[PDB]
RNA sequence: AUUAGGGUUCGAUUCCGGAGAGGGAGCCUGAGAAAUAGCUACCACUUCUACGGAGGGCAGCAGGCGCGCAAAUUGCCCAAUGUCAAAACAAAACGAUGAGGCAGCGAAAAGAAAUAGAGUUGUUUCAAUGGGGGAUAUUUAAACCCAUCCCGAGUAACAAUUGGAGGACAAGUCUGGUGCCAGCACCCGCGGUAAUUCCAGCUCCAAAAGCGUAUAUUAA
């Protein structure tokens, strides 16, 4: 044995990050969450159910 | 850019021939810190002391936010009394103090070497 | 009808508690010395050692896998142990005669998971964090 | 070595870190008062719990006990001067009814916004941190400053700020420097 | 330290008491020592030498070697606090002090706190300020830090992280890869070609200048 070691990790195709624009660090981030969740069954991030 | 001076806790010390007080300085709309030399001249004028060299001012602290500074001040009767009783480091700030001695490390090694010898040659 | 109750019966109650505390498995282990001698670590949280060879341990049923491990000889008392190497790959970072830092597995000497008889884990190799190498935040020295 | 300056902690984390009901309530307070992290709420909890603990002990003692007459009027005085309780409540059992919002309204950040110097709590926070607000002619830069009742009528713009009697700001001065350079 | 109460556990370490100066004995001086930067001998180590001989004791402060999971600069000063003393200070004319103080290193731990704010139409403006750079100066024994005051923000690139998303436990029937392999998993359990659990991308969750892991210990 010991030959099958790191098999899947080296098999996975490389995909790069997207490099999105930055976010409001600090008190501004807490403000953003408050204005999204409140004052516009509660659902957090919902995937497109069209898959199945 | 004016300066106003007020002395809070006045005490007269017959021993050591001086007067002690706390100095408060108000300098609204002043750029930076007030130099110690300027405070001396106003203090001498306010208290009618003949020679401004008779006034000694210690460490000043500025209030947070600006516009006020507080320190400590001494007024000696004579100029000779000031030079006789003042600490050397404060006399150096004024301008008339004894020169700095050689480094303590050199003094330590010289004395340790001399501990070996005994005669007039030490 | 299980305990004495007298006002001047303190001596009996003190002796009764002292003998019955020994029946507590956890209390006894912390107040005797047999466990400390058995522990390959001398009561420490970590230890350093030399890698002797690389071995594979079969996972216990109903799981099926080959868990990658190494056998280490500790520098402080020359005892030999078996340490698990976590994360995908991560066996290539470890070579024979390398110095490693070993830690516990999280259950205070009890075996963990489907790995039979393994209670130690590798966290550092050649003075460099093993997880740091895995994330490529550092390079293997020498 | 041989240093005798004291220090202590002012907050502690809750049990049960992932309770959904508590998480929503804490998020409510954070957005309503413009706080930075949950630690600002938790230090309010410790102050409240300390006050209720000493009130509970005093109420067990009989009335006319010396330790109740003294230390009972003292704590009630503290609540009155700071504004946690109105003057009508003088019983020593109304301290046990204090809530977290009752303390959070007396912060300088909330007081400045409510008075009218700022348009939002978030605008209030930056004003305090930028040395624009003075309390009784003293500049205060700490958003968690607890305002006394007698000090509320003396809250105004600082005389050294451009919004008061101070010189011009940074961008106005930078623009003027560029204009003079031309 | 933790704890409704009763309790359990830690205390080498700043103040008080005791004991020791590699080990073990013995002693002189002295008001006071069985003293160790005093003496005498033996044991174990160890330095110089012209070979006749002569020396050594960091569990003081810095440093070095080993040991280990595991712990700073061979720095400045007697300005303050004290101690000794033949001694106020000053005048030809400055007592010593690794006690003690000051700074350097230092995410053990503890406070306070940035990483924006306000607006107009269906993307375009407005002020404000720190980090930073300097000061007639201030502080300091001398320096340093703080405090005070000006030339300076628009990817305000002056660009926040650490763990997670079946259950306990807040948060995805998403999209590729792998195919009881690789691997995850504190526990229950995932993986055998349609993986809510592995490797990745995206999007979300928690705490946040902090967040994981190991080993002890208190509550549970
Ligand atoms: Mg200003
Ligand atoms: Mg004890
Ligand atoms: Mg012996
Ligand atoms: Mg040393
Ligand atoms: Mg995932
Ligand atoms: Mg899939």
């Amino acid at each position: 044995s010991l030959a099958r070691a790191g098999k899947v990790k080296n098999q996975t195709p490389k995909v790069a990050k997207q490099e999105k624009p930055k976010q409001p660090r600090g008190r501004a981030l807490k403000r953003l969450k408050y204005t999204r969740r409140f004052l516009s069954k509660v659902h957090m991030n919902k995937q497109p159910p069209g898959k199945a | 850019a004016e300066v106003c001076i007020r002395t809070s806790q006045f005490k007269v010390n017959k021993l050591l021939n001086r007067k002690q007080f706390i100095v408060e300085v108000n300098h609204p709309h002043w750029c930076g810190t007030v130099p110690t030399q300027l405070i001396r001249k106003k203090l001498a004028t306010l208290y009618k002391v003949p020679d401004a060299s008779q006034v000694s001012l210690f460490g000043f602290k500025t209030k947070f936010g600006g516009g006020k500074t507080t320190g400590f001040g001494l007024i000696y009767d004579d100029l000779a009394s000031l030079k006789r009783f003042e600490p050397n480091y404060r006399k150096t700030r004024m301008g008339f103090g004894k020169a700095r001695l050689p480094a303590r490390k050199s003094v330590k090694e010289r004395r340790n070497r001399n501990k070996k010898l005994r005669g007039k040659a030490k | 009808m299980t305990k004495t109750n007298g006002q001047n019966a303190a001596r009996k109650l003190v002796r009764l508690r002292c003998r019955n505390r020994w029946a507590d498995k956890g209390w006894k282990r912390a107040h005797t010395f047999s466990a400390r001698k058995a522990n390959p670590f001398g009561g420490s949280s970590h230890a350093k050692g030399i890698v002797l060879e690389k071995i594979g341990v079969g996972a216990k049923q109903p799981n099926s896998a080959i868990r990658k491990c190494v056998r280490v000889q500790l520098i402080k008392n020359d005892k030999k142990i078996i340490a698990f190497v976590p994360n995908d790959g991560c066996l290539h970072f470890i070579e024979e005669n390398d110095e490693v830092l070993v830690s516990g597995f999280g259950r205070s000497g009890h075996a963990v998971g489907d790995i039979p008889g393994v209670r130690f884990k590798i966290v550092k190799v050649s003075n460099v964090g093993l997880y740091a190498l895995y994330r490529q935040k550092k390079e293997k020295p020498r | 070595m041989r240093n005798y300056n004291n220090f202590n902690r002012v907050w502690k984390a809750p049990r049960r870190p992932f309770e959904k009901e508590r998480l929503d309530r804490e998020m409510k307070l954070c957005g309503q008062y413009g706080l930075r992290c949950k630690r600002e709420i938790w230090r309010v909890n410790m102050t409240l719990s300390k006050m209720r603990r000493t009130a509970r002990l005093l109420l067990t003692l009989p009335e006319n006990h010396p330790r109740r007459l003294l230390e009972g009027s003292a704590i009630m005085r503290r609540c009155h001067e700071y504004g946690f309780l109105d003057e009508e409540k003088d019983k020593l059992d109304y301290v046990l009814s204090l809530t977290v919002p009752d303390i959070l309204e007396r912060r300088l950040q909330t007081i400045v916004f409510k008075a009218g110097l700022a348009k939002s709590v978030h605008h209030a926070r930056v004003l305090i941190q930028q040395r624009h607000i003075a309390v009784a002619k003293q500049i205060v830069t700490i958003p968690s400053f607890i305002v006394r009742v007698s000090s509320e009528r003396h809250i105004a713009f600082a005389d050294a700020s451009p919004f008061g009697n101070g010189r011009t700001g940074r961008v106005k001065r930078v623009r003027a420097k560029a204009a003079k350079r031309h």
Side-chain angles (χ1 to χ4, degrees), chain A residues 1-18 20-40 43-50 52, chain B residues 1 3-28 30-97 99-109 111-119 121-122, chain C residues 2-35 38-60 62-141, chain D residues 1-87 89-182:
Chain A
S1 315
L2 286 224
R4 273 147 20 231
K7 160 191 166 182
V8 156
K9 177 129 161 66
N10 308 338
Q11 224 155 6
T12 306
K14 295 285 306 213
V15 186
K17 284 283 198 23
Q18 268 289 350
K20 273 79 73 213
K22 57 205 269 269
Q23 230 58 32
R25 291 98 163 72
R27 170 199 46 76
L29 195 56
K30 296 291 244 150
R31 178 184 194 181
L32 175 35
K33 281 202 242 270
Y34 170 79
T35 195
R36 214 97 67 159
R37 277 134 82 133
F38 312 117
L39 52 87
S40 310
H43 262 65
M44 308 267 210
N45 79 308
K46 208 196 157 56
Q47 300 323 104
Chain B
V3 152
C4 177
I5 281 140
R6 189 217 210 81
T7 79
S8 74
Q9 289 163 5
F10 200 84
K11 191 216 255 283
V12 48
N13 205 353
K14 291 287 167 44
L15 331 148
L16 312 180
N17 323 332
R18 51 175 214 213
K19 315 164 164 192
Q20 313 152 191
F21 46 88
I22 286 169
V23 185
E24 199 207 59
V25 178
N26 311 264
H27 51 285
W30 177 279
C31 288
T33 54
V34 183
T36 300
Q37 288 282 66
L38 189 137
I39 300 141
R40 245 205 291 281
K41 321 302 189 246
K42 266 86 184 292
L43 220 46
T45 285
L46 202 83
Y47 270 89
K48 302 128 209 142
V49 344
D51 180 347
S53 285
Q54 306 181 1
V55 188
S56 207
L57 304 166
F58 310 163
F60 278 85
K61 293 317 174 303
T62 66
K63 191 85 165 153
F64 179 81
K68 178 176 105 34
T69 312
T70 313
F72 202 82
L74 294 193
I75 292 172
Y76 285 91
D77 304 332
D78 316 347
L79 178 62
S81 269
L82 179 136
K83 272 154 187 243
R84 149 168 265 201
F85 292 136
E86 254 298 308
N88 193 238
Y89 81 93
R90 292 213 283 263
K91 257 142 52 142
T92 299
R93 292 160 170 197
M94 305 262 210
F96 32 86
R100 200 113 200 191
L101 285 163
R104 207 164 67 119
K105 145 181 302 303
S106 305
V107 186
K108 287 162 163 288
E109 322 215 77
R111 157 202 332 143
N112 273 131
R113 295 194 225 100
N114 274 335
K115 287 226 226 161
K116 265 75 169 272
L117 330 170
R118 152 187 193 71
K122 89 158 44 192
Chain C
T2 36
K3 64 178 78 173
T4 182
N5 205 51
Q7 165 99 261
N8 299 324
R11 176 168 285 120
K12 182 82 195 305
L13 288 173
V14 169
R15 287 185 274 110
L16 196 129
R17 180 59 51 234
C18 184
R19 80 164 295 256
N20 282 104
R21 276 185 331 229
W22 290 109
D24 199 347
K25 267 214 307 193
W27 192 92
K28 184 166 195 211
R29 167 197 281 300
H31 287 69
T32 51
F33 286 147
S34 90
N39 184 201
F41 296 179
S44 316
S45 62
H46 292 74
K48 243 180 250 204
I50 312 287
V51 174
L52 303 174
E53 55 141 346
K54 312 183 201 178
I55 74 166
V57 182
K60 290 173 27 202
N63 287 4
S64 181
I66 284 86
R67 309 261 172 250
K68 251 60 81 169
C69 301
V70 284
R71 59 186 288 254
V72 178
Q73 210 201 337
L74 305 176
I75 303 179
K76 44 147 58 176
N77 47 26
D78 290 331
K79 288 178 218 271
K80 300 185 170 181
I81 64 176
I82 281 172
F84 172 66
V85 174
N87 285 321
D88 207 346
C90 279
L91 196 76
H92 313 305
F93 295 126
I94 287 181
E95 281 297 351
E96 262 101 356
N97 302 138
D98 282 353
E99 293 237 1
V100 289
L101 182 76
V102 192
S103 94
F105 222 169
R107 285 186 74 179
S108 282
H110 198 287
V112 177
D114 56 11
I115 327 186
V118 173
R119 64 241 299 141
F120 298 111
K121 164 187 54 175
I122 299 286
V123 302
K124 254 180 125 184
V125 51
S126 305
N127 232 297
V128 161
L130 187 57
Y131 193 55
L133 294 165
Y134 177 66
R135 312 273 56 171
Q136 309 189 117
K137 303 201 164 120
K138 217 89 86 66
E139 315 298 325
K140 182 77 194 281
Chain D
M1 268 283 302
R2 294 181 171 89
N3 190 300
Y4 306 106
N5 201 40
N6 217 358
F7 58 93
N8 283 279
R9 85 183 172 217
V10 298
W11 70 275
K12 82 165 47 150
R15 301 277 262 126
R16 315 173 94 92
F18 296 119
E19 187 205 329
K20 185 127 199 74
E21 195 166 21
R22 176 185 59 79
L23 285 172
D24 296 336
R25 172 157 40 77
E26 267 162 17
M27 185 84 285
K28 213 61 65 174
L29 295 172
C30 205
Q32 198 201 312
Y33 293 98
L35 309 176
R36 189 183 87 239
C37 56
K38 312 292 211 85
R39 211 193 294 115
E40 262 145 44
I41 307 174
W42 294 337
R43 75 178 166 199
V44 176
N45 280 340
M46 197 196 251
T47 301
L48 257 167
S49 94
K50 263 151 182 223
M51 275 163 58
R52 286 194 306 261
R53 164 151 62 254
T54 186
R56 264 199 309 279
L57 183 175
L58 282 195
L59 290 162
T60 36
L61 292 177
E63 181 41 355
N64 298 351
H65 186 108
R67 202 168 170 289
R68 185 164 177 175
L69 310 180
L70 191 40
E71 269 171 52
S73 32
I75 174 153
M76 284 288 285
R77 184 204 166 201
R78 249 174 266 131
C79 294
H80 285 312
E81 316 296 89
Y82 281 80
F84 304 147
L85 273 192
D86 48 357
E87 310 65 354
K89 299 302 194 55
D90 44 359
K91 212 38 181 142
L92 192 55
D93 60 8
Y94 293 117
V95 201
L96 300 178
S97 275
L98 261 64
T99 48
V100 171
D102 284 357
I103 285 83
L104 284 175
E105 313 263 347
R106 313 297 286 125
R107 318 211 326 155
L108 191 52
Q109 183 179 7
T110 308
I111 293 302
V112 155
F113 163 69
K114 249 65 160 304
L117 291 328
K119 324 207 260 283
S120 59
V121 288
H122 302 93
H123 188 61
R125 186 118 183 179
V126 299
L127 277 182
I128 309 275
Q129 270 294 114
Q130 271 148 359
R131 309 165 63 97
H132 291 312
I133 272 76
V135 177
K137 299 305 132 172
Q138 162 77 247
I139 282 178
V140 180
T141 52
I142 312 301
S144 40
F145 189 98
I146 305 293
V147 179
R148 291 211 261 255
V149 170
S150 69
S151 326
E152 214 176 314
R153 22 161 308 171
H154 305 98
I155 289 149
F157 283 102
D159 291 358
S161 39
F163 304 118
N165 318 328
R167 320 183 28 159
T168 207
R170 163 153 162 199
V171 62
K172 279 165 169 294
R173 164 225 291 148
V174 159
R175 229 168 36 201
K177 295 319 211 132
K180 295 169 59 175
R181 258 61 152 275
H182 298 141

